[PDB]
Nucleic acid binder design. Structure first.
Length: 200
DNA sequence: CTGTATAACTGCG
DNA sequence: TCGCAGTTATACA
């Protein structure tokens, strides 16, 4: 059972992959195993200013690949068992293959990500992005680029739950921005995995 | 009267 | 507490 998220230029799908017990166990393993970037590899350039990201970021994937956004180039660490497990299961459910994962960890509600598109050149054309979430439920927001205005297109708000999958299909990242806004009342951490296909 | 894009912040309301 | 506007210790097209 998928919840289909559809608006003008919006093709996305939402389902729960794992029940609480399995998702807790996976979350616990991710906390133990995932190594996040620090220092120089945790700073981005936006509107002429360099900033430390208000979260932690990690990349894992096939060797030779890189991911660049906002003046920050992230190189992938080799795959680890917990990530291959999540990847293989997602690939089974969707029929899609992934060679890269960007991991975002929001320690609480003050950690967030500003709105953006996954529009980078090293992303394979038309390829989906698989967004898997563990830990605290957080509100995810889809916003149309012509509404931020020429178009009065309504915003799409959606909670991403523990053990859930959000499939972001083409042309979502062409027309729609997304963000995880600050939620002050959230005190627990959240780990999000966006599986991607990267051009060699 | 008129270039677009901008993964973050501040300065508001 | 939340959300919007503007923005540029800029970079193109």
């Amino acid at each position: 059972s998928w919840r289909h998220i559809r608006a003008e230029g919006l093709d996305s799908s939402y389902t729960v992959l794992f029940g609480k017990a399995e998702a807790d166990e996976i979350f616990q393993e991710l906390e133990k195993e995932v190594e996040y970037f620090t220092g120089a590899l945790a700073r981005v350039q936006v509107f002429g200013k360099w900033h430390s990201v208000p979260r932690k970021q990690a990349t894992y994937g096939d060797a030779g690949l890189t991911y660049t956004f906002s003046g920050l180039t992230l190189s992938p660490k080799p795959w680890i068992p917990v990530l291959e497990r999540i990847r293989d299961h997602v690939s089974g459910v969707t029929g899609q293959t992934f060679n890269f994962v960007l991991i975002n960890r929001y320690k609480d509600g003050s950690d967030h990500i500003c709105e953006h598109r996954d529009d980078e050149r090293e992303l394979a054309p038309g390829s989906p992005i698989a967004s898997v979430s563990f830990g605290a439920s957080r509100d995810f927001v889809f916003r149309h680029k012509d509404s931020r205005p020429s178009r009065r297109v309504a915003v799409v708000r959606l909670p991403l739950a523990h053990g859930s999958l959000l499939m972001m299909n083409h042309p979502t990242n062409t027309h729609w921005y997304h963000s995880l806004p600050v939620r002050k009342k959230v005190l627990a951490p959240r780990v999000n995995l966006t599986f991607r296909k990267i051009l060699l």
